């Protein structure tokens, strides 16, 4: 398919279209030319005037984030963590036998000049430190991560949590809107101190102060939502990592997986910097995400639909994507889970049971599925299109440019 | 929907595009643990 | 399925997915690193002040827990018990022949210094302590555990129970939402106490203030549904367990059965600590919640729901397991209980019925091998008759609520 010629004149046509660039980056190539995550922490003075800096700035419109950003790195001296074995990602030591390392052990480094206020504030509060001030500061970035009325259902997670052993309450300003703490997500170091803290509190679940994940978990496997969907795909199936490698069935789903599964990424070790590449600017463009894995994000939230996932009811419905083949081979792959049960005898008092035309294979096989779609002329049943029929039925209040909506107004006419 | 263009001619082409395209699935087995699919095998009218 | 090679290129490629610690942790393996149970009570200093503290901090304020952690072990502090025989748990012994033991025969300890009002409040308050005061404090667990607008439908009750030869009035005056008192949860003092209290009282049913337990006793067995659900499932079924265990019929329900059943966690001992391996700080990850016994949990449920259970309509519907392959094996089981009534004959007159007197029909009795037989016959797929059975057991369920097992067995079997 080289050259192509208008037959009417037999002249020879170039087709092409415009370029697409934005590679991805993985989290490997990034150690690859950088040794260390640099988190830059302005200025360096004064840790209760801080303190007093963040108070006065929060109860109105205005505060800076290198001065919360300063404040979150003094009180969260966090020095405790006795190592249960070792702790090594990306080439990177970070602990051996049982060392006592902290939180910042991802390098700091100093930056510029510019501050606001005068030395000495307000003296007014103490003792808030290491209790509740850094836990707000943290969820608020969770908080942000959102622009429909969910964030004032979500602000109730922050005054109910920090009032857990600390007891405080009200304090912003303007609702939302982007405009008031959702600008944090925007400074690199800031969404650095909040991956460091989620990753400490990862490897440490039995601290003292592990309640500061309520607002920093939401960005472990940030934009890694691809894996996600993958991991919850063999969940809904059953079926091993392998298997349902094997009911992939378009070429471009294959191609997604393999750059998903590169091997040298580390994506399935407990403690890695892999699920925080994105705040921890490890890559600018997830090649996890389900922007850069469309077919295959689409495809595998279909089929858990059809299976019955009650998740995949709201994933977004991604553009530029063979929706037709992609639906067909997600809606073959549910009809060959949902209608081969699994179904075997687990236990006995010593009394087993032994289990040994174009009608549906036996088990949940690729190759016999695809040779009884041979058989069937390559396009689904009456009975598969009833499946799909009672499996989307009967589905209540779904939103715009979901594959729920697409999924129901696909089979249910 | 632009005006002064064959309307009835260029949408029995997309139709006809769109069938091909959305009746016959790509469909082919991309990855397996040593066992393929081997694809061997209404010879009158029947779609392609 | 080691090896997995992409075909057009001849490649390996290599699945997998994120890991998943957070692992279950077991009752018996905790006493197996220590031999007590920490109790901080932090000031033991002047029983009578603390009980105006309370009473002052609770109308309206933020009482300290530390407050009413001192004043619920100070009026607690009745050395009433008389043992009936032994109580020993996970080789803790707790009591012999007729000791007088006390609700804190358990470890306690001191902790820090600090208070707050400093000294002797207000004399204002009366006896009336071990009354109704702990009573009250205790059931705020009970009315914290929850956040739908049950809350106010369960402390009007509270209120009412507190007038056992007592009769006074309420307290506070703002809403819960977690904000007040539900701070207390996440006390493991707290919950220590009200775990010691629960299990006192549960030893002593007959005694005074075994009242207390009504509002404690959302402590017993917490996070600890899934064994309920299978002891449901045993009481709606009518089989032994075994029988039931039988009747699992997918690997991760298996599975989940397993890790269950461990042989040496006194989950059938009468009065033992198992129950509050949560509250009383045993416990990080519960074997027995229903988080970790997903699979198990939705298929004991459903088949519960198939056979009229009234706790099954509003059961959470768990993520992340098998809705397909579980629901036809709920449906297999369910259908083979409500098929094969037990029926049999239990007395006479001297005049018994002996039961020794049509290609496709569902088996005799409630055996698995001969239904798996009959429904390997059945093509692996669901009858006609089953599906009616379940749409009939489905149809005329009113006001299910979103994500329970019930709107979805509703949605599935009834079209």
């Not at chain 1, 150690?31 to 922490?41: A, D, H, Q, T, V």
């Not at chain 1, 510019?114 to 504030?121: A, K």
């Not at chain 2, 632009?2 to 087995?29: F, K, M, R, W």
Request: with cysteine.
């Amino acid at each position: 398919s080289v050259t192509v010629k208008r037959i009417i004149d037999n002249t020879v046509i170039v087709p092409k279209l415009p370029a697409n660039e934005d590679p991805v980056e993985y989290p490997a190539d990034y150690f690859r030319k950088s040794k260390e995550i640099p988190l830059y922490i302005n200025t360096t003075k004064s840790l209760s005037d801080l303190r007093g800096y963040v108070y006065q700035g929060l109860k109105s419109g205005n505060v800076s984030i290198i001065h919360v950003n300063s404040y979150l790195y003094g009180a969260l001296k966090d020095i405790r963590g006795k190592l249960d074995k070792d702790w090594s990602s990306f080439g990177i030591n970070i602990g051996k036998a049982g060392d006592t390392i902290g939180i910042f052990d991802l390098v700091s480094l100093k930056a510029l000049d510019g501050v606001l206020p005068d030395g000495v504030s307000d003296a007014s509060r103490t003792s808030a430190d290491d209790k509740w001030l850094p836990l707000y500061l943290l969820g608020l970035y969770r908080v942000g991560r959102t622009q429909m009325p969910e964030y004032r259902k979500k602000l109730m997670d922050g005054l109910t949590n920090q009032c857990k052993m600390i007891n405080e309450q009200f304090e912003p300003l303007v609702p939302e809107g982007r405009d008031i703490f959702d600008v944090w997500g925007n400074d690199s170091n800031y969404t650095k101190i909040v991956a460091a803290v989620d990753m400490f509190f990862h490897m440490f679940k039995k601290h003292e102060c592990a309640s500061f994940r309520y607002g920093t978990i939401v960005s472990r496997f940030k934009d890694c939502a691809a894996l996600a969907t993958f991991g919850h795909l063999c969940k809904i199936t059953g079926m091993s990592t392998e298997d349902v490698t094997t009911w992939i069935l378009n070429r471009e789903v294959a191609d997604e997986m393999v750059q998903m599964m590169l091997p040298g990424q580390e994506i399935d070790k407990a403690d890695s910097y892999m699920p925080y590449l994105i705040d921890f600017g490890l890559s600018s463009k997830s090649p996890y995400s389900s922007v850069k894995n469309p077919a295959f994000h689409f495809w595998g939230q279909l089929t858990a639909l059809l299976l019955r996932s009650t998740r995949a009811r709201n994933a977004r419905q991604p553009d530029d994507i063979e929706y037709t083949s992609l639906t067909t081979a997600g809606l073959l792959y549910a009809y060959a889970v949902g209608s081969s049960a699994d179904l075997a005898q687990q236990f006995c008092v010593g009394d087993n049971k032994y289990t040994p035309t174009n009608a549906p294979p036996q088990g949940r096989d690729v190759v016999e599925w695809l040779g009884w779609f041979e058989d069937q002329n390559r396009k689904p049943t009456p009975d598969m299109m009833q499946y799909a029929k009672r499996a989307v039925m009967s589905l209540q209040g779904l939103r715009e440019k979901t594959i729920g909506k697409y999924a129901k107004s696909e089979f249910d006419k | 929907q632009p005006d002064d263009i064959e309307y009835t001619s260029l949408t029995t082409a997309g139709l006809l595009y769109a069938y091909a395209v959305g009746s016959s699935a790509d469909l082919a087995q991309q990855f397996c643990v040593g066992d393929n699919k081997y694809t061997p095998d209404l010879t009158t009218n029947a779609p392609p």
